Structures are given as C-alpha cells and as structure tokens.
C-alpha cells in the first residue's frame, strides 16, 4: 500500500508517526549542504602537478608555436589533438578556448542576437519573438542565458534516451524557434544519455528557421562512475551526413577533469560555423590562453591519460552516489512517494517527490539544517509545473555527511507527502 492509497485515518496516523522522526532530525542541529555540483578537494588534489606545469623552459606547442606570446584564435594543436583522439572526431572540428565552455555558449548566442549567425537572414535582435527549446529537468545556467536574452523558453521532457523527439520535431517547425539546449551524456540532472537514434533524429529533422542551432553541451563526455566510458556520438559529423552541417554547436571542458574554473573549454562545430566564430572572436580579442592549454596537454599526455584521470574521479565519486542511492532505497522504497534516477555518470541524482510537495520538502530540509537546491531550479524561469523535482549533488561532501543528510531528506519527503495526502 503506497501513501497515496492510505485511508483518511491511516494517513493521519502516518503523519503523527513521521513528524516524531522530523522532530528527532531537527534535534541533531545539522548544517549540511547537498547543493554544490562541484568536485571535492580530494578530486582537485589529483591535478596537483598541473599547478607546476608546463614548467620552466617548456613553452613550445607541437607545431613550434611559442605559447608565451600573442596570437592564434583556435587553441594549440597539442590539446586539440588530445581532445579529437578522446572524442574520436577529426582535429579540424575542435577549437580550444579559455576555462569556460559556458562563456563560449553565451558568446555564440549573444553574437547570433547582435549580428546573426552565418545562416541568419537577419540578427535575432530583429525578431519580435525568439523561442528556445528546453529539455527538462535541465541545467539552470543554460536556462539563465536564454532568460537573460528574453527568449521564450519552451520545455520538453528529457527522457531516458534524450529529449522527446516527437515534441522537438514539432516545435522546430515554428520559425520563431532558433535553438535548443541539451546535455547529451549523463545529463544534468537526470543522468540520461542521448541514443544514436535520437541524435540521428536531431540531425535529420527539418526546421523552419534557416539558422536554428542545437547546443550540444557534452559537459560529462567522459565522466563515468564505472569502468565503462560512454559512447561519444560524433554529432557534428551526423549533422554533416544528414545535410545539416551547421546545426550543432558542441561543447565540452576539463572543469570536472582538472580544475573547476581553470581548465580548458572546447567548441566543436562545422567549418562554416568555426569561421564565423573565429571571425567574431578575433575582434573580441587576440586569442585564448595557450599556456594553460600546454599545461593541460603535458598533464594528460594523451587521451588514455585523460581516461586514467577519469577513473580516479569515478573511484572518488562512486561511494558518494552509492550512499545516496542506498539511503533513498532503505527509507522510501516501501512508500511509493518518490522516484529517483540511478545514473552511471555525471554529477547529479534527480529526485521526484509527490507532485505539489517539492517546495515543502526543501523548506522542511532547510528547517532541519539541510540545504537542497530549490524547487524548479532545474526548469526555465525556475517553474516546475508539477512542483515535484529536486536535484541532489553528491560530489562534494564526505560519505558520512551524505548518509546523515539523505536520511534527513528522506524524512522530509515522507512528512511533506503525509501533509499533502492528509490535507485532501
């Protein structure tokens, strides 16, 4: 019997039962935080050597470029080739920038707004209405960019195999629709991964805008919790094979590989998109930081060296995800109140509670000293129309803290659920 099927008296009694547990939780005086989607100090210690790279006297890229001096908008060959080898794409596809792929995403959108992109009839700023497809739950920092530009964000469901392509294929037939966000591997926060079939559909679909763009933000391209590395779909190639070569603006970075905020970002896109991008980037400045790129190339040495680092991250993160999953199972399984993802990579667990109660869960957790990301944080304009979803970030705290925190979260889920069904 799930809580929702409890009779009026049994849910009342269940409410009194669980409230006693919530009282016990508050008497612990906790100060715990499950909101930080960032690496732990242990993980950051793995790249300690990179703080001393590339090192005295070592300042030449593989083509002879003196990385210490001005020039070159594309990034250095050394790091571009490593990433090409890692991702299994031609090196010509890869541009290496500064430490933020979000910076590049914002820029390409900004420039499409000001100038148009290379396929634009006119700049997006001339449009009365720009719409933008948002698979949900999704990444708040993506949705913030499109909200700051005033684009009308239209949500679609992020499914186990990727965005709902029936919904996307329909929405792109509207010429107001200029692009979409996706995190295609271990998606933030669902953990879901775009299948080959879904990528093919994104690559082959017809769009009403001539200048429509998919942001394929492959932020977790190698970020497994297991021994297996996920498939890297060559999405730019698929777009090329389908006759839509310019469709995909693809990104990734080293921010959760080396140093979070001081890594290297990558922008993978078609020949014509790269010329457009570097033509605008060359007015914005002289080019990206080559020294940090050489440092990175030296640290990894080759693509296998990147995978070796990713196995260390996996070994550090796995027990944290396992604790969270173990607690959710032991406390909530019998009650039918919640569903949670079981991800095999990435940085998050996505928790759906009773619809109408997510904001109350986070409020109760706060009263109990446990910080949860707010209700709607994974939705455009922070509006989850079912008030059900919560994002859990296991990476930073030690396992002992995750145990305590999640035990409390689970009590909060139950109490909120008991309040909700008792109020019917």
Ligand X SMILES: Cc1ncc(COP(=O)(O)O)c(CN)c1O
Ligand Y SMILES: Cc1ncc(COP(=O)(O)O)c(CN[C@@H](CCC(=O)O)C(=O)O)c1O
Ligand Z SMILES: O=C(O)CCC(=O)C(=O)O
Does position 79 bind ligand Y by CB under 6 A? Answer: no
Q: Out of 19, 21, 26, 38, point to the residue binding ligand Z (CB under 6 A).
A: 38
To a second copy, the closest distance from the beta carbon of 147 in angstroms equals 8
- What are residue 351's DSSP bridge partners? 340, 390
To ligand X, the closest distance from the beta carbon of 285 in angstroms equals 5
Q: Out of 101, 273, 373, 389, point to the residue binding ligand X (CB under 6 A).
A: 101
To a second copy, the closest distance from the beta carbon of 311 in angstroms equals 20
CB 350 within 8 A of CB 157: no
Interface segment toward ligand Z; rule CB under 6 A; list 30-38, 296-304, 328-336, 412-420: 30-38
Does position 101 bind ligand Y by CB under 6 A? Answer: yes
Tokens 């920092």 sit on residue: 141
Output the 3-class SS for 202-267: HHHCCCCCCCCEEEEECCCCCCECCCCCCCCCCHHHHHHHCCCCCCEEEEEECCCCCCCCCCCEEE
Does position 291 bind a second copy by CB under 8 A? Answer: yes
Does position 285 bind ligand X by CB under 6 A? Answer: yes
To ligand Y, the closest distance from the beta carbon of 184 in angstroms equals 10
Q: Out of 35, 110, 159, 174, point to the residue binding a second copy (CB under 8 A).
A: 110
Quick note: the x/- pattern for ligand Z over 65-104, rule CB under 6 A, is -----xx---------------------------------
**Torsion sign over Cα 106, 110, 116, 118:** negative
Pick 124 or 335: Cβ nearer a second copy: 124
- What are residue 266's DSSP bridge partners? 96, 252
- What are residue 389's DSSP bridge partners? 352
Q: Out of 71, 128, 227, 423, point to the residue binding ligand Y (CB under 6 A).
A: 71
Tokens 């991008």 sit on residue: 277
Q: State the number of CA atoms in the 13 A half-sphere of 93 facing the CB.
A: 25
CB 378 within 8 A of CB 136: yes
CB 162 within 8 A of CB 192: yes
Q: How far apart are CA 336 and CA 357, in angstroms?
A: 14
Q: How far is CA 18 from CA 157, 325, 338, 412, 416, in A?
A: 33, 21, 16, 9, 10
Tokens 């196995």 sit on residue: 311
Pick 271 or 381: Cβ nearer ligand Y: 381
Pick 14 or 277: Cβ nearer ligand Y: 277
Does position 258 bind ligand X by CB under 6 A? Answer: no
Would you give the DSSP letter of residue 286? S
To ligand Y, the closest distance from the beta carbon of 15 in angstroms equals 33
Does position 176 bind ligand Y by CB under 6 A? Answer: no
Among candidate residues 361, 368, 364, 407, the one with its CA nearest the CA of residue 387: 361
Subset of residues 258 to 277 that bind ligand Z, contact rule: CB under 6 A: none
Subset of residues 61 to 80 that bind ligand X, contact rule: CB under 6 A: none
To ligand X, the closest distance from the beta carbon of 337 in angstroms equals 27
Does position 188 bind ligand X by CB under 6 A? Answer: yes
Q: How far is CA 262 from CA 4, 82, 257, 289, 303, in A?
A: 48, 18, 10, 11, 19
Q: Out of 139, 186, 192, 421, point to the residue binding ligand Y (CB under 6 A).
A: 139
Q: What are phi and psi of 208, to 5 degrees?
A: -75, -40
Pick 54 or 343: Cβ nearer a second copy: 54
Pick 43 or 357: Cβ nearer a second copy: 43
Q: Which residues contact 32 (CB under 8 A, 6 or more apart)?
A: 369, 370, 371, 397, 401, 404, 405, 408
Pick 217 or 384: Cβ nearer ligand Y: 217
Q: Which residue is nearest to ligand Z (CB)?
A: 37
Interface segment toward ligand X; rule CB under 6 A; list 81-89, 94-102, 116-124, 394-402: 94-102
Does position 286 bind ligand Z by CB under 6 A? Answer: yes
Buried b (16+ CB within 10 A) or exposed e, 80-104: bbbbbebbebeeebbbbbbbbbbeb
To ligand Y, the closest distance from the beta carbon of 28 in angstroms equals 25
Q: Out of 68, 126, 141, 284, point to the residue binding ligand Z (CB under 6 A).
A: 141
Interface segment toward ligand Z; rule CB under 6 A; list 5-13, 35-43, 122-130, 228-236: 35-43
Pick 70 or 227: Cβ nearer ligand Z: 70
| Interface positions with ligand Z (CB under 6 A) | 36-38, 70-71, 141, 286
Provide the binding-site residues for ligand X, judged by CB under 6 A.
Answer: 37, 100-102, 139, 183, 188, 217, 219, 253, 255, 265, 285-286
């Amino acid at each position: 019997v799930s809580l929702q099927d409890f009779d009026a008296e049994r849910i009342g009694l269940f409410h009194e039962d669980i409230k006693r547990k919530f009282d016990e939780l508050k008497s612990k005086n906790l100060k715990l935080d499950l909101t930080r989607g960032k690496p732990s100090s242990e993980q950051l210690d793995f790249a300690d050597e990179l703080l001393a790279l590339p090192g005295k006297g070592d300042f030449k890229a593989a083509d002879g470029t003196d990385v210490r001096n001005y020039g070159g908008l594309d990034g250095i060959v050394d790091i571009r080739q490593i990433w090409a080898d890692l991702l299994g794409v031609p090196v010509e596809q890869v541009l290496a920038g500064d430490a933020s792929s979000l910076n590049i995403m914002f820029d390409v959108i900004s420039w499409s707004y000001i100038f148009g992109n290379n396929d634009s009839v006119q700049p997006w700023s001339k449009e009365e209405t720009v719409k933008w497809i948002c698979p949900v739950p999704g990444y708040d920092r993506h949705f913030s960019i499109t909200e700051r530009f005033g684009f009308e964000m239209i949500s679609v469901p992020m499914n186990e195999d990727g965005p709902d392509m029936d919904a996307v294929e329909e929405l792109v037939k509207n010429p107001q629709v200029k692009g979409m966000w996706v995190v295609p591997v271990f998606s933030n926060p669902t953990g879901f991964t775009v299948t080959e079939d879904v990528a093919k559909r994104l690559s082959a679909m017809e769009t009403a805008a001539p200048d429509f763009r998919v942001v394929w933000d492959n932020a977790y391209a190698v970020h497994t919790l297991t021994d297996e590395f996920p498939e890297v779909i060559d999405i730019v190639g698929l777009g090329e094979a389908a006759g839509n070569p310019n469709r995909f603006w693809a990104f990734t970075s080293t921010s959760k590989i080396t140093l979070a905020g001081a890594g290297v970002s990558f922008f993978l896109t078609s020949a014509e998109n790269r010329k457009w991008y570097t033509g605008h980037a060359g007015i914005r400045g002289i080019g990206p930081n080559k020294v940090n790129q050489l440092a990175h190339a030296r640290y990894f040495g080759d693509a296998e060296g990147v995978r070796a680092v990713m196995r260390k991250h996996a070994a550090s993160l796995a027990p944290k995800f396992n604790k969270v999953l173990e607690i959710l199972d032991s406390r909530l399984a019998e009650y039918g109140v919640a569903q949670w993802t079981v991800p095999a990579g990435g940085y998050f667990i996505s928790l759906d509670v009773v619809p109408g109660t997510a904001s109350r869960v986070a409020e109760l957790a706060k009263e109990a000293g446990i910080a949860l990301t707010g209700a709607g944080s994974s939705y455009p304009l922070r509006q989850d129309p079912e008030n059900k979803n919560l994002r859990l970030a296991p990476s930073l705290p030690p396992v002992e803290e995750l145990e305590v925190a999640m035990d409390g979260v689970a009590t909060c889920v139950l109490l909120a659920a008991a309040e909700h069904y008792a109020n019917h």
